[PDB]
Amino acid sequence: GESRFYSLGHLSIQRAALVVLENYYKDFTIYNPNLLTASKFRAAKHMAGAMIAAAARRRDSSHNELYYEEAEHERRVKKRKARLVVAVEEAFIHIQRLEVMDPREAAQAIFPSMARALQKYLRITRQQNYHSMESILQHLAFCITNGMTPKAFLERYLSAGPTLQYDKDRWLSTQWRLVSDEAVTNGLRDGIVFVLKCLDFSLVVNVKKIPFIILSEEFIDPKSHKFVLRLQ
């Protein structure tokens, strides 16, 4: 359901879809199917077992497992995040900017003191398929080279991040499908919907005309900004 709004001029549905995909790779967090499986297993668990309003009334009166599981998961993520911050700070303190070694070997030197905390954080945030050890070592040597702090190294891993952070095979720009009820060479107009389908997800794009705006002046006298100590 991640959603962003974009302004476009007179483009065709093709070219509007192209600008939408540019902004998709720049702006949306990367598609993670592992963040979606909890809702699927919850719906399948409901599949394991007038009347439709009473069943909803019995559901909403029951114990909400989801609230407490989300609070407990958020607490575990904050704990693993604090462990990871401490591990990466005490890993970066082990080397000095100045045995002499290049940033790749310095990254390989200080990585075993942060590796387990990062592995546990990427498992709890379901990001472990996105970062191989080679990728983490390359980004580690990158941050050691450019004088970046532990938090600046760690911002790649703390949040989801957009699609272009990741490896070039993890995004796939050749597998895009454009669904439209009309010809895609037609220009945009108010109320059309076109869908940009990837292999698992889709970008549902509905187009609205930017409204006709009427401006008018009104004069505020700058002498009319007088205030009193009386209460209002």
Added chain:
Amino acid sequence: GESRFYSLGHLSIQRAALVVLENYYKDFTIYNPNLLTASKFRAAKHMAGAMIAAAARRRDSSHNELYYEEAEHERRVKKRKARLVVAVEEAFIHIQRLEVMDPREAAQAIFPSMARALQKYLRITRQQNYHSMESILQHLAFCITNGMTPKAFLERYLSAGPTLQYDKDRWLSTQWRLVSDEAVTNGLRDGIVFVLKCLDFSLVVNVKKIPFIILSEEFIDPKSHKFVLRLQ
């Protein structure tokens, strides 16, 4: 499961059971069947739906509804308790020790400013069958007579309290049954079990001999209490 230990001499099982029942009416909180129905409905909900160890493993790995429901119930009880304390304090502040009225009419005057908070607290703590409005008004006039504070009035209602606080019909001393594997005129000895059955509950009493204790002196020289500033 409420349990207390008592020391007794050479009594018969009859007379030991009598002393146990004296201490029952003095010491144990009153039998409340409404505090027991949650476990019964939970066991019936398990009745609604090698392998016995794997089922226990799947149970203990699941979401514990009971922990969060007990925490939420304890939070609601603390909130209703705070409402009740504020209501009874601002009820007792409405009259003065000195229209002139006796403590019964003063109790009836200040009771509608505390009645709803007390009703909600007795419902959330499942004590509403134990206190009629007449009983609360008599105890209210009792505390107004004797110069007792709001908290001293309220301690009858905040906790469960023993069986002799309550009305004389709510305890029932004529319906006691003594179960014993031997003759009840026999004296107590080590390891006997006798059961005192009421209509719904029972007092399971197992008797242990108080052990043979061997004392000895050892001499500690009061000059040998010398200490040093050195760390230990």
